[model samples]
Target: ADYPIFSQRFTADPAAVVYNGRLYIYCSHDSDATPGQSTYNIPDITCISTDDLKNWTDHGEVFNAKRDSRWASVSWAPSIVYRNNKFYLYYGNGGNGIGVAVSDSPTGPFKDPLPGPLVSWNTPGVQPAQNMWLFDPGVFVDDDGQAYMYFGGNGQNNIRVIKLGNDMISTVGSAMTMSAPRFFEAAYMHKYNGKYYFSYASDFSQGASKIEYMMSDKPTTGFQYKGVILPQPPDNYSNNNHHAIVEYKGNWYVVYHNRTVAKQRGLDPVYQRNVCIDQMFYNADGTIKQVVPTVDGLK
Candidate 1:
């Protein structure tokens, strides 16, 4: 089977989850609808579900910016987690802030649980600091059942994390900023074998994007920068960044998106992006090995 189950339109910034014996993939969909061409307005987010890796069922648009005027424009990298019998979809609203929605199931009709933005640029006096663009929300729940949110973009050359309250609605402790120059966005954290691993995209967004890693014994502090975990593939068609990792059946897999089409005349590249998956492994000391790009098909 081809890597991505769905190949129509542009699908990027993928988030995956296992629900009810099926895999659910939710991603940002960039619509090709022309301006003033109201015939088709692609929703900000679309989702698909599959029991087997070979076949997928399009769940249509699971979330859209039009649901609220505040979320009027772009919907960037998203991370969804299931908690307390409901699915919480955490996403960055353009460059403004992070927002969340709730659904009864993974293939959601997800609606914002509260009004306005969840964690935005203006959270009282918490004004954006240290390259904090407040975009690219990656929520991780530690083994202790405590939830933490990580997010940042170009402005703040690093990712920041803060413990979320029991309701998972607001920040609990003071935000902890992870410093890693040249690596600005897409922060993802996972706990494995008594260690918390942080992975993020390094370098500028335009040319030769790479994925890097850091490790810490505790979730909230003392992280040491590790080396690159995934480098750009030779094809150069896709500027890979903003990704997520999932572990299933005792194996780990890195799920990301890549641009499939090339640039056209007088227009930016079409970015007919499709979600791609590859196997992931760690070194002898439990350090993650670099993820090389492969199109051998999604297993």
Candidate 2:
């Protein structure tokens, strides 16, 4: 079989989590909307679950990006987190701002739990670092129960941090400054061995994008660039890459997207993609070993 655990539709920017003893991954749906390329037109969140990594079940569109007719199009870089009995889904509406959806269920029929964009230009004090690079929202709740959110994407500079209120709908303070080497977009936060790892799609330096990361003792400060993970798979569609690092059942995995199928079929891999996971490892020193993408099945 192929590396993409699920193959029925074009999937990208996988946001994965473990729920009720199963791995549930959320991805942005890519459709052939723009001429000669798959662009954002009816973009929404597509969820799939696997009890064992070999087989998968589709959960359909868990959150409608066009709900309430707010933007009506352009939903990108979807991320989800479960907190305080609610599943909070964060997404960028064409960089207009970040929006939130809440559901009691992890695979959600999530609704707009807030009045509007949770973080936007009009959102009191959230000035854009790199010309409104307000996409790719990531939420992480530390051991202390304090939650934090990260947002950045497609700009001269792209990184910012903020505290999430207890309700998960509001912000606690102003945005915090955060950056990494060669960073473009795709902000994801994962913690391991008492060190915080911030990963994203590294920009430039190649024909394709690769997963790069930094390490810190705290969520909002002191992150030092470490290295790259899944850096432009040999079969990548020659475009961008987005990924999520996850731990399930005592084994670590890095879930990322590539356009191998699109390339194999003589198509533009940038808009056509698939989801793949490779085993992730951390050295005794606590730094993550760079993962190499393979056709090896999750089984």
Candidate 3:
């Protein structure tokens, strides 16, 4: 009965990373709901591990915003990567900024690697809003081991891309903006065959959100809006979504969230989402196929 991934806790904003032949998903914890009102005080990140895609084991909270992070109330979504033998975890700090922690292990009781926020409201060109259009971040390291940071809001004129220094904590230059079509929020990056893929959530006609992607030949230039990755909503036509995509064991998969599982618990569909995974196939020409959501995910 692993259809909703983890049964002990409700999760959202999935960020999956593959390291050492095993796949780990880092998600924003959405527990302790305040019924009749939307849950917004989620204050931790959870990790789930699986050497085989179907069987998953909870790794517990790898990073906690309540006890570990300062100046932040919401732990929100998190992005992570392994580089030069270190694990870098990037996460939102109350939608006012983003922070990073470092650890020697993938499942970490990570400590703040920097003195303060990596990117914040004080960071030039950032606004002080209380939503997704400000704090979501995605990071990618290229084939030559160069790192780039992509973040911004769900609103217009927000998506940004910047080059990160060798330290993976500071900016190397001024951030550049992108005119991505239908872009709402949730930025994630990946590389394949020398092509860079920038995927995100976008607004749709019926108030539902969809996963769309942008393609480019370089790390920070010449992006062309590709197409929708999955245009359909998750069960009950959930209004919003966030995701991460990766290749594992020579196969590709898209990881996202839906409210269906939580809905069964007599919970509101707007909160307490369950993270899910599905197989992704691409055309020989590098186009993605529309994913068909299922009950038995990634089987």
Q: What C-alpha lDDT do the candidate models reach, one value each?
A: 0.71, 0.78, 0.79
Residue-level lDDT tens digits of model 1 in 1-299: 66444666667778777777777778888676465553223357878777766678888778776673345455667788878888888777776667787788787777766667777665643454755567777888988889998877664345677778767667775766666647667888888999988888877644576777789998857778888877764333546565788876567778776654323223333344566667789888999888867765665
Q: Model 3, 167-232: lDDT tens per residue?
A: 887877666777577677788889887788889888665456888888899877788888889765
Per-model TM-score, in order, reads: 0.87, 0.92, 0.92
Clashing pairs in 3: 133-153, 133-154, 154-184
lDDT (tens digit, per residue) of candidate 2 on 18-86: 888899888887764367554554368888988888778899888777763254355677787877767
lDDT winner among the candidates?
A: 3
RMSD of 2: 2.1
Clashes of each: 3, 0, 3
In candidate 2, which residue pairs get closer than 3 Å at backbone N, Cα or C atoms, i.e. clash?
A: none
Q: lDDT, candidate 2, residue 79?
A: 82
lDDT of 3 at 70: 61
